[PDB]
Structures are given as C-alpha cells and as structure tokens.
JSON list of C-alpha atoms and ligand atoms in Angstrom, two decimals:
[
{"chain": "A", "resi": 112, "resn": "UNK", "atom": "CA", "xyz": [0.00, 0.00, 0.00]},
{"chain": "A", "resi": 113, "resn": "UNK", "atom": "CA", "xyz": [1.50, 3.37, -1.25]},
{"chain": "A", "resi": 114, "resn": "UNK", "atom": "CA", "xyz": [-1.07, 5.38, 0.14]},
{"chain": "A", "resi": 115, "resn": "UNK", "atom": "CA", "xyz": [-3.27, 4.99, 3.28]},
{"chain": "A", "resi": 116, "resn": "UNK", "atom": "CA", "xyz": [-7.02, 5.08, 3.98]},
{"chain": "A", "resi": 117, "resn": "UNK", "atom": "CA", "xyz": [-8.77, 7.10, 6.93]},
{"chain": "A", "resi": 118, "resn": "UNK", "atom": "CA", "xyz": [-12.02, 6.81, 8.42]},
{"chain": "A", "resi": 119, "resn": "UNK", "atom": "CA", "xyz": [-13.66, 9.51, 9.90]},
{"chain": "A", "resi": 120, "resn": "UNK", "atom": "CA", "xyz": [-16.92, 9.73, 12.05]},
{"chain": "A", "resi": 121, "resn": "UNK", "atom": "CA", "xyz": [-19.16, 11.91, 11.35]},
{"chain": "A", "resi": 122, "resn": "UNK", "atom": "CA", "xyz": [-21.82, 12.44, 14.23]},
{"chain": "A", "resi": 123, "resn": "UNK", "atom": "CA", "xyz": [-25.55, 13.62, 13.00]},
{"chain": "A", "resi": 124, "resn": "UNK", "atom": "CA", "xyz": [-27.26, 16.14, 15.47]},
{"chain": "A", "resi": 125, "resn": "UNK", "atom": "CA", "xyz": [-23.92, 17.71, 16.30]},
{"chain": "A", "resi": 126, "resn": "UNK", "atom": "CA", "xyz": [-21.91, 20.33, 15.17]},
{"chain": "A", "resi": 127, "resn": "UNK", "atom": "CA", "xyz": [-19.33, 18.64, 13.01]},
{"chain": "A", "resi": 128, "resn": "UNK", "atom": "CA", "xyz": [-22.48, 17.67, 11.33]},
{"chain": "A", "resi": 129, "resn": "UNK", "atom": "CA", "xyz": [-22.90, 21.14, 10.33]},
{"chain": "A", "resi": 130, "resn": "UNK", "atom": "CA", "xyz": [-19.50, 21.84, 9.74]},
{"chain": "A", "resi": 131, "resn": "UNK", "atom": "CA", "xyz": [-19.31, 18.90, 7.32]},
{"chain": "A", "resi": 132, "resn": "UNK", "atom": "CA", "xyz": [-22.84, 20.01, 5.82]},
{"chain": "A", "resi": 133, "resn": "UNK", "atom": "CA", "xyz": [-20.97, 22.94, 5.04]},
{"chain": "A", "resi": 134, "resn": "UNK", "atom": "CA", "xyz": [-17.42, 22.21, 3.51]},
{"chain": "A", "resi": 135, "resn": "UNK", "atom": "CA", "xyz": [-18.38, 18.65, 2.44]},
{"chain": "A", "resi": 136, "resn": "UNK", "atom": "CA", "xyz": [-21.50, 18.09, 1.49]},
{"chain": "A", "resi": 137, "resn": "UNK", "atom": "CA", "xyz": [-22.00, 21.48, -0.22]},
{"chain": "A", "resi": 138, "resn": "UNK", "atom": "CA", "xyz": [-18.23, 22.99, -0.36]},
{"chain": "A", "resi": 139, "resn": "UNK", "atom": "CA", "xyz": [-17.57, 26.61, -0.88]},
{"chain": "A", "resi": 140, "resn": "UNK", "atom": "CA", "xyz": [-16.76, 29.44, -3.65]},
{"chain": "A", "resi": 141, "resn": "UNK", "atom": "CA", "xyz": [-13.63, 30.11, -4.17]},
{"chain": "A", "resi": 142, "resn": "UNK", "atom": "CA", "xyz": [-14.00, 33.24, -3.38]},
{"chain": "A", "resi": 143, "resn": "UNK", "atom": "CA", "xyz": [-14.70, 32.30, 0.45]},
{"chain": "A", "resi": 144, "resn": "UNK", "atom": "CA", "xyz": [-10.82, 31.35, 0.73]},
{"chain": "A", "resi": 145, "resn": "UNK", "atom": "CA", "xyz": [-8.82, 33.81, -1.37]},
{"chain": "A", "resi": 146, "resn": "UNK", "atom": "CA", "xyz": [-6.62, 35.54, 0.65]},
{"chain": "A", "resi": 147, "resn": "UNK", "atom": "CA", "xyz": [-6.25, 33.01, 3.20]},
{"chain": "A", "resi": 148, "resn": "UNK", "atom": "CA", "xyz": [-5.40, 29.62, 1.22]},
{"chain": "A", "resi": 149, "resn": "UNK", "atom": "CA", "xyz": [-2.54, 30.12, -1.50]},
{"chain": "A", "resi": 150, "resn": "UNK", "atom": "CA", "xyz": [-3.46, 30.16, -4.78]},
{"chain": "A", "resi": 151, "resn": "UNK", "atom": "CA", "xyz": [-1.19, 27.32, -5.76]},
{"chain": "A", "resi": 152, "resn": "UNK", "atom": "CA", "xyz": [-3.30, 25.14, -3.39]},
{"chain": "A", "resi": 153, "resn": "UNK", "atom": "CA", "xyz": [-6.69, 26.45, -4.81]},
{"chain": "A", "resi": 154, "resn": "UNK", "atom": "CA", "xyz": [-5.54, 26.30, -8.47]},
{"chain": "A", "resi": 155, "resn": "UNK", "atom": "CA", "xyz": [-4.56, 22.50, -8.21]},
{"chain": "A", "resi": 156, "resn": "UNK", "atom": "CA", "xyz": [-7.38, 21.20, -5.83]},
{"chain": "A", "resi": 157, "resn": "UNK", "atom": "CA", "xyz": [-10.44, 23.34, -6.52]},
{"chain": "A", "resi": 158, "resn": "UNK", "atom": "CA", "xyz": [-12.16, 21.90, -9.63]},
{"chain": "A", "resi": 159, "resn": "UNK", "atom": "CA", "xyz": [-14.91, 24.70, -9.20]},
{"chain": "A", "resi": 160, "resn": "UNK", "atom": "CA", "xyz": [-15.93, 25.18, -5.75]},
{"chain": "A", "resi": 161, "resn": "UNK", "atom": "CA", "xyz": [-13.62, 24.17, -2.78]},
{"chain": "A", "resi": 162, "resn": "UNK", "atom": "CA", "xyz": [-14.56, 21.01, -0.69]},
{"chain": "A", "resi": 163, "resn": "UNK", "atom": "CA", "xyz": [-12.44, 20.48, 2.71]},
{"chain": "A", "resi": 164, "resn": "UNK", "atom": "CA", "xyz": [-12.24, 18.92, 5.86]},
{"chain": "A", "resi": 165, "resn": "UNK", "atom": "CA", "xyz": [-10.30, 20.09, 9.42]},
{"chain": "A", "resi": 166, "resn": "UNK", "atom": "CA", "xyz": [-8.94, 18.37, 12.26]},
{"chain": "A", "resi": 167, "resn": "UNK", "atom": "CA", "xyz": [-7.27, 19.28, 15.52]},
{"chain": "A", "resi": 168, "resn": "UNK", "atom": "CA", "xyz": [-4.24, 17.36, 14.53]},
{"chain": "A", "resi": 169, "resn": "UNK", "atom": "CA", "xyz": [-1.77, 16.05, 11.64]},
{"chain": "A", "resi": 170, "resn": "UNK", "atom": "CA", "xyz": [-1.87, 12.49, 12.47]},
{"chain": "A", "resi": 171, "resn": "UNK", "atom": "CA", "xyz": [-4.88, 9.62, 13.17]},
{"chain": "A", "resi": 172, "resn": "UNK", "atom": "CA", "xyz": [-3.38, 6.70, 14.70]},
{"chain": "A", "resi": 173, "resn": "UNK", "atom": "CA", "xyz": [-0.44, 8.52, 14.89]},
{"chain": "A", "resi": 174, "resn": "UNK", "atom": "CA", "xyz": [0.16, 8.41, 10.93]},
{"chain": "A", "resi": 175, "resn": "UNK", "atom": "CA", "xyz": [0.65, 11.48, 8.87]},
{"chain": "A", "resi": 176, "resn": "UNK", "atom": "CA", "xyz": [-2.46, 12.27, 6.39]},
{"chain": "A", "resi": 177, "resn": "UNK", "atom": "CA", "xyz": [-1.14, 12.63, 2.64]},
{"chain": "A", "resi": 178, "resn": "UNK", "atom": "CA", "xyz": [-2.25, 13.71, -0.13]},
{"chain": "A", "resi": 179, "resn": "UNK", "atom": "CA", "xyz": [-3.74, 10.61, -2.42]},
{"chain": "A", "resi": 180, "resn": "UNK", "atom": "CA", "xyz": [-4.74, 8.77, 0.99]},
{"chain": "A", "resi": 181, "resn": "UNK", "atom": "CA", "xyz": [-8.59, 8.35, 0.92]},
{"chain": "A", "resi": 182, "resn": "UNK", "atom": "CA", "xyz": [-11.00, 8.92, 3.69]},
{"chain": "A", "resi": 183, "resn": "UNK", "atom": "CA", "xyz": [-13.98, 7.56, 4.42]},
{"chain": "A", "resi": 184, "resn": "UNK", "atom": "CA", "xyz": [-16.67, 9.38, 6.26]},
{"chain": "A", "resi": 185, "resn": "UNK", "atom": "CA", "xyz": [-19.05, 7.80, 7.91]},
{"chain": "A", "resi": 186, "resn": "UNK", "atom": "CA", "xyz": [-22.24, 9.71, 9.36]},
{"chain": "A", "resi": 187, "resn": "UNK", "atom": "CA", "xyz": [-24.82, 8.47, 11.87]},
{"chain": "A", "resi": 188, "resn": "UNK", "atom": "CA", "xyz": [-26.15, 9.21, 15.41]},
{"chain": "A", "resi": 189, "resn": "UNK", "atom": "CA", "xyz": [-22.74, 8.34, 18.18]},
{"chain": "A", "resi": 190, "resn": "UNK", "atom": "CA", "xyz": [-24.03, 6.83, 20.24]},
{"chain": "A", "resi": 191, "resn": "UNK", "atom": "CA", "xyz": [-21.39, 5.57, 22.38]},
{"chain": "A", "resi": 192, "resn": "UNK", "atom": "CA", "xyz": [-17.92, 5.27, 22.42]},
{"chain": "A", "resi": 193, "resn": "UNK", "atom": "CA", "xyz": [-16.78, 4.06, 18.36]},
{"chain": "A", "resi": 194, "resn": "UNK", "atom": "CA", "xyz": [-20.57, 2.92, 18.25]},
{"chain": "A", "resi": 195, "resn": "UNK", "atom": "CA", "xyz": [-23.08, 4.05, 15.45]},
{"chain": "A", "resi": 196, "resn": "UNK", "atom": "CA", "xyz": [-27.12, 3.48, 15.98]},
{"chain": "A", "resi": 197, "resn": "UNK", "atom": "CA", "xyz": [-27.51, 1.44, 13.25]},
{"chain": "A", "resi": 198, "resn": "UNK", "atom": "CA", "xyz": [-31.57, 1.63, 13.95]},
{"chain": "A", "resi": 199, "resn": "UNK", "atom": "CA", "xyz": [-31.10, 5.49, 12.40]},
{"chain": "A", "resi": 200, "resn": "UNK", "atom": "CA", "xyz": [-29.81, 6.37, 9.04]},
{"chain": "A", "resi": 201, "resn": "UNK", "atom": "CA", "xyz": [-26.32, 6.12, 8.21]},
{"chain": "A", "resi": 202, "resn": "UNK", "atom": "CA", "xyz": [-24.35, 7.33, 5.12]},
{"chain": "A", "resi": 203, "resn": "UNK", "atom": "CA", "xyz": [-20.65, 6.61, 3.77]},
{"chain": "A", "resi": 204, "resn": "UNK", "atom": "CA", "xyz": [-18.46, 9.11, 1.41]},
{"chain": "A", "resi": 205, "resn": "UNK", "atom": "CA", "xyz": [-15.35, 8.60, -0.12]},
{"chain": "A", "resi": 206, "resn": "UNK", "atom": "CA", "xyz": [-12.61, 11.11, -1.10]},
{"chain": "A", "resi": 207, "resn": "UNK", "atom": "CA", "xyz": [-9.33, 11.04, -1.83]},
{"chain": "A", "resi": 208, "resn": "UNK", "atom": "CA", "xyz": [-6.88, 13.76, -0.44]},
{"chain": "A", "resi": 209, "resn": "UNK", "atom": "CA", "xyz": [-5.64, 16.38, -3.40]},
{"chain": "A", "resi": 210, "resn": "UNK", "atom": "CA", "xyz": [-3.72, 18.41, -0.54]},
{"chain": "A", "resi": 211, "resn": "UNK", "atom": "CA", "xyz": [-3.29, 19.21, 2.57]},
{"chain": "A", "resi": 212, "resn": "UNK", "atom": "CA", "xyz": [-2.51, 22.27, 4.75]},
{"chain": "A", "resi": 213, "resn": "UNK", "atom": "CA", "xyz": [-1.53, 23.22, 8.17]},
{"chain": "A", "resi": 214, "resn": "UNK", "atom": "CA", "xyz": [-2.75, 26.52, 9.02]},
{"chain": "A", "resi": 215, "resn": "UNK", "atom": "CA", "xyz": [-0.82, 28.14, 11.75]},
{"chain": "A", "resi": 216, "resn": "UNK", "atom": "CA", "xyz": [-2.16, 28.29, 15.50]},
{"chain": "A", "resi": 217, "resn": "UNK", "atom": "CA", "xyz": [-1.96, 31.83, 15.14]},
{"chain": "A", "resi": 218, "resn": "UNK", "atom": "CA", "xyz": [-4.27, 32.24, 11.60]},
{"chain": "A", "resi": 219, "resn": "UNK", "atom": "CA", "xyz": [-6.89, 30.11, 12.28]},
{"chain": "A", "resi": 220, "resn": "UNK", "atom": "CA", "xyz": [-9.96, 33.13, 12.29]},
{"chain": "A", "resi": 221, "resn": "UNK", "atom": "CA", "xyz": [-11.02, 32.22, 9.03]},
{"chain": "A", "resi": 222, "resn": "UNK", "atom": "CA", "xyz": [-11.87, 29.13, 9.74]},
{"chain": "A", "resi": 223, "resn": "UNK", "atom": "CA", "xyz": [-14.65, 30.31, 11.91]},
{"chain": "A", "resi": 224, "resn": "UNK", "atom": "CA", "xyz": [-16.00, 32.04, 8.75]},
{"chain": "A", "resi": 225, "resn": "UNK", "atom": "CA", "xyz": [-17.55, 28.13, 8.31]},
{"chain": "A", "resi": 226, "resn": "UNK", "atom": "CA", "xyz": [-16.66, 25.90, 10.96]},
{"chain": "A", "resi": 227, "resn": "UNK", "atom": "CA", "xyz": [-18.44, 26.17, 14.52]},
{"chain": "A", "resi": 228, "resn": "UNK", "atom": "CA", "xyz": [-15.23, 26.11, 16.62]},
{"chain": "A", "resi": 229, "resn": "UNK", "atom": "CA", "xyz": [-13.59, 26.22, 13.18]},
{"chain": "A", "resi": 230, "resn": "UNK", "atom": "CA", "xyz": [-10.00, 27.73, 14.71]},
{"chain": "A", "resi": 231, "resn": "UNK", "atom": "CA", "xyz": [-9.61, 23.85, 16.32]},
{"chain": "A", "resi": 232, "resn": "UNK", "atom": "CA", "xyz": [-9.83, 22.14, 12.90]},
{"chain": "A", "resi": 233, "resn": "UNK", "atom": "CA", "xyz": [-6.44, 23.79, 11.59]},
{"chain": "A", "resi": 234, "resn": "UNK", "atom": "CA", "xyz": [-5.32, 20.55, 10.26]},
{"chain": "A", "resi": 235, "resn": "UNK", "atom": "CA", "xyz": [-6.78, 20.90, 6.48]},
{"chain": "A", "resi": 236, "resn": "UNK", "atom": "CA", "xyz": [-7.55, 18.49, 3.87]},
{"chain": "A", "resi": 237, "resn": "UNK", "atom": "CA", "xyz": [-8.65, 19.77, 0.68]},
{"chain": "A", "resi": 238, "resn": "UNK", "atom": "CA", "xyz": [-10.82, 17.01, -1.84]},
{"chain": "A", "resi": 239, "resn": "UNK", "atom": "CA", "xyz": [-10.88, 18.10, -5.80]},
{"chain": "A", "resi": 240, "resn": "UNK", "atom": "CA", "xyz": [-14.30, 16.32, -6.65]},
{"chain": "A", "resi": 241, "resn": "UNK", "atom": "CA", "xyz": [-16.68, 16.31, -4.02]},
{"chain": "A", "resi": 242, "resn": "UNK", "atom": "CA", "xyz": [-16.86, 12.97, -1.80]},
{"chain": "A", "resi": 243, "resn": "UNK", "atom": "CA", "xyz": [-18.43, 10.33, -3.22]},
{"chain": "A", "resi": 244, "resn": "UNK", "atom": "CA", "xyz": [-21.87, 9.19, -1.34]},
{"chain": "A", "resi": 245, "resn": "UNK", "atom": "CA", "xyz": [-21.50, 5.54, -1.48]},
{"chain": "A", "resi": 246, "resn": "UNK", "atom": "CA", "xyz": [-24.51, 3.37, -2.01]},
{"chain": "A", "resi": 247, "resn": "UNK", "atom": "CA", "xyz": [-23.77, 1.22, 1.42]},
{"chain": "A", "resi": 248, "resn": "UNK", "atom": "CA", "xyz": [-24.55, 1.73, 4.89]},
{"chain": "A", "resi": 249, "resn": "UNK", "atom": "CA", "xyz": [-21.84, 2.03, 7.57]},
{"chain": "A", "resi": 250, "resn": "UNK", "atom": "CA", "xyz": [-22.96, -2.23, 8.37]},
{"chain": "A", "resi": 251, "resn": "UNK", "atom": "CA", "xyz": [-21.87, -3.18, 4.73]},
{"chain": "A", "resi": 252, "resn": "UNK", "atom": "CA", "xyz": [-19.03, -0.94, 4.24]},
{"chain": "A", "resi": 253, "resn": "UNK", "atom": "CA", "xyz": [-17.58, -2.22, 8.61]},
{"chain": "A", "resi": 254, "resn": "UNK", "atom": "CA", "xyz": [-19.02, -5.72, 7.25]},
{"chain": "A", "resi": 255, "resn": "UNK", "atom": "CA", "xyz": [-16.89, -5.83, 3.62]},
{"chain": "A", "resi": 256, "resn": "UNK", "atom": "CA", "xyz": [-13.62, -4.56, 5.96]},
{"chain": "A", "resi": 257, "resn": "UNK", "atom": "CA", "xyz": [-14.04, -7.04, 8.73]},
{"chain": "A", "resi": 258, "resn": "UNK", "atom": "CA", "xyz": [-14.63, -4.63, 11.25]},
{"chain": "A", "resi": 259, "resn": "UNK", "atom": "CA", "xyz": [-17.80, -4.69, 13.85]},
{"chain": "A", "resi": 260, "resn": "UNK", "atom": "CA", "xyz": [-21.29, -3.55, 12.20]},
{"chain": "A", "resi": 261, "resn": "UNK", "atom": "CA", "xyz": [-21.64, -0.50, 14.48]},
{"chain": "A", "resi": 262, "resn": "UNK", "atom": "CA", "xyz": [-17.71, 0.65, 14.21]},
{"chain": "A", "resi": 263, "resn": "UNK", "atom": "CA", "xyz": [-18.05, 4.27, 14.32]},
{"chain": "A", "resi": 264, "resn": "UNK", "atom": "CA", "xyz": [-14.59, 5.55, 15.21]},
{"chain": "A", "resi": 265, "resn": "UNK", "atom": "CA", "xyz": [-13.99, 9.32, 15.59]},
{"chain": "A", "resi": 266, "resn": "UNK", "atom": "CA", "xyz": [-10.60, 8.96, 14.01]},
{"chain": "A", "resi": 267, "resn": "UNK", "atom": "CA", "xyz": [-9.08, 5.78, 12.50]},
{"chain": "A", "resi": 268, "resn": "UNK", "atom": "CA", "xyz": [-6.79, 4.04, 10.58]},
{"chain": "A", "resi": 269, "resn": "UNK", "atom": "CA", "xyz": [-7.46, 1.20, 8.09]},
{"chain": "A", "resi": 270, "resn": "UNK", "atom": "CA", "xyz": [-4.54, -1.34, 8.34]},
{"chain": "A", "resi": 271, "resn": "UNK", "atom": "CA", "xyz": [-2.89, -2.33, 4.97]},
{"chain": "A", "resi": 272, "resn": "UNK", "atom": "CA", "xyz": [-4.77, -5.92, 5.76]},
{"chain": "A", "resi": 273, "resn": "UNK", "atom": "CA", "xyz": [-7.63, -4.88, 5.43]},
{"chain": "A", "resi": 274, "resn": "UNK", "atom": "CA", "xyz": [-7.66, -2.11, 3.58]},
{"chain": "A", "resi": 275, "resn": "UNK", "atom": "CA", "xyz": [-5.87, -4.46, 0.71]},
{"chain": "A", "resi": 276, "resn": "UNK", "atom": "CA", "xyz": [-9.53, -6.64, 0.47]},
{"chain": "A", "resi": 277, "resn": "UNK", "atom": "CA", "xyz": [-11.58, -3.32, -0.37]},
{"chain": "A", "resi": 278, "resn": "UNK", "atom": "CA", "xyz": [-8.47, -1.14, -2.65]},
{"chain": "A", "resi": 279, "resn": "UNK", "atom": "CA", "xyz": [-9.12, -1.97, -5.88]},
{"chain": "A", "resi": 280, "resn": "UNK", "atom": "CA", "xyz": [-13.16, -1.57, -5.07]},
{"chain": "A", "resi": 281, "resn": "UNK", "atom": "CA", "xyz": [-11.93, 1.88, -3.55]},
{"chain": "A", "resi": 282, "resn": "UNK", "atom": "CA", "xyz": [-10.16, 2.97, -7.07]},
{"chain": "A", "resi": 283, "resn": "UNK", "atom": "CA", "xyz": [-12.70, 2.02, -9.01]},
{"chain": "A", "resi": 284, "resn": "UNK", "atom": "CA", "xyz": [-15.29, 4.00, -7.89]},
{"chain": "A", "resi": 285, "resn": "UNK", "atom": "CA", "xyz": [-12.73, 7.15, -7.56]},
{"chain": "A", "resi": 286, "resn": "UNK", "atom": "CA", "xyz": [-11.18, 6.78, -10.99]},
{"chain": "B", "resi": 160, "resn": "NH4", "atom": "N1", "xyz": [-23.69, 29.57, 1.31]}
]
C-alpha cells in the first residue's frame, strides 16, 4: 500500500455535522478562501468550488495524512464510544486527499467564517471532486472490511490488511 485510507466519524445532530454540511457536502466558492489559502493550493485542488475537511491534529493513529490517501466518512447518530445506531440512518463518502494544509495556530480566524469552533480544525484536507456518497450503509461498508457492524470511530486508521480486500473496489469507484 502506497497510500493509506482514513475513516472519519461523522456524528448527525452535532456540530461537526454542520460543519461537514458545510465544507463537504455542499463545499464553498472560491471566493470564500482567497486571501487566506494560496493560490497554488486552490488552483490545483479546486475543480470549481472548494470542498475540505479540518482536524485538531496532523496524524490519526499517529500516521501522517497525505495527499492521495482516501477517507472515508461515515455519518450516523454516536451513540457511544466508536458505536453508530444502526436503527437510524447512516451514510458513507469517499474522497481522496488532493492536498493538505496546516494553518498556523496563530491564523486560524477564518476558519470560523464556516466551521463552529472552526479555529480547532487547523489541520486541512482539501478534496478536488466532491466525496463520493456511497450506495452502502456504515454495516456493509464495517461488514466488507471485517470490522464490527456498528464501528463508528472518531478517528481511524485502516490497516494495509484490510484495507488491501476493499483497494481496488476503492479505485474504481474514484477513478
Ligand atoms: N452559502
């Protein structure tokens, strides 16, 4: 494996719900980041509008995120610790990284311009097409990798095991 694959939680009813409503699900203009994100990085990874993700850190499972790794986000109700409801809806998307930037500690105002709490998610990812809304639930998708139905994990890593059984699925449906 030459690149590595990320899973993400999404919870519904929250605020990273909202946050992810807003700079996944429908992305922003351009326009909304000039002046704050070079324009090397917006040239090469904004396709039309901008689509992005934040996190409080550089690292899940203590390895770096990269561009070309993909993520997976899952969204559903938490309701427990790594645990999903799967008696409420649940949705998968996949993306694959085009870049990523670290905004300083000390720059991260814009990011409440999106974000509630945005100046914690200073950790960007940036995704050139928008995520992909799979057609599975969070059951198949945890089912097809081996992992628990109800595997909700706020941050993980998918080892290469595993994530070698589902790869060339993965690529296929990004290509
Ligand atoms: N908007």
């Amino acid at each position: 494996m030459e690149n590595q694959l990320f899973i993400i939680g999404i919870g519904t009813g929250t605020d990273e719900y909202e946050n992810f409503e807003e700079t996944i699900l429908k992305g922003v203009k351009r326009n909304e980041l000039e002046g704050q994100i070079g324009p090397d990085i917006l040239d090469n990874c904004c396709s039309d509008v901008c689509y992005f993700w934040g996190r409080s850190k550089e690292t899940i499972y203590e390895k770096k995120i990269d561009k070309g790794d993909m993520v997976l986000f899952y969204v559903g109700k938490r309701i427990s610790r790594n645990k999903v409801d799967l008696n409420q809806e649940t949705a998968v998307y996949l993306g694959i990284i085009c870049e990523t930037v670290e905004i300083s500690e000390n720059d991260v105002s814009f990011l409440n311009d999106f974000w509630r709490k945005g100046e914690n998610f200073r950790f960007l990812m940036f995704f050139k097409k928008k995520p992909e809304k799979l057609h599975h639930s969070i059951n198949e998708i945890n089912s097809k990798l081996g992992y628990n139905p109800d595997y909700f994990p706020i941050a993980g890593y998918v080892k290469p095991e595993r994530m070698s059984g589902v790869y060339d699925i993965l690529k296929n449906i990004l290509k």
